[PDB]
Amino acid sequence: KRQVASGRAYIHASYNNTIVTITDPDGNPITWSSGGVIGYKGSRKGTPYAAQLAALDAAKKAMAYGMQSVDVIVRGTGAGREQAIRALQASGLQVKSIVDDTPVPHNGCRPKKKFR
């Protein structure tokens, strides 16, 4: 009910999960998916296969919205951070460009004990 025909795709990948949000050229989201949206529940959500399935599910929902041309934004690092982009390439969506916009601070906040 939108007929967007073009937009962005943000891939947020971590070591516990990978999620894909397909949005429009001025930032508002259209659809999304993740390792928990699909069957997997626990650490299974962090596998590259779950990332591939999440990317494919989000891409098919975008097809339902009528998406053809997609720009890719990538934030984070984890298993399947690349598999998501590979499935997104071979999903049937013409990939416009891939961009890694992983937010990194300028040494602002103190991390948790795990991260020091």
């Binding site: 990538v74 460009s97 891939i98 961009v99 890694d100 916009d101």
Partner: protein, 70 residues
């Protein structure tokens, strides 16, 4: 690979307003290039870093950028 100073003129390392030449010393991202790729001495690099930060605060040089093709 070519170092920045090797392909450049007799330019001012203390000019924070010349974006044309200061852009050469930034990376694909907004990061300052190391001495391995700038071919500068320690003193030259130390002056270049401060001039780059000066230009950044004046909105002439990017504080950070986005990586492509990743």
């Amino acid at each position: 690979k070519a170092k920045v100073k090797a392909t450049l003129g007799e330019f001012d390392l203390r000019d924070y307003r010349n974006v044309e030449v200061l852009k050469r010393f930034l990376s694909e991202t907004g990061k300052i290039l190391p001495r391995r790729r700038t071919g500068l001495s320690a003193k030259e690099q130390r002056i270049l870093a401060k001039t780059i930060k000066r230009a950044r605060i004046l909105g002439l040089l990017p504080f950070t950028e986005k990586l492509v093709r990743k």
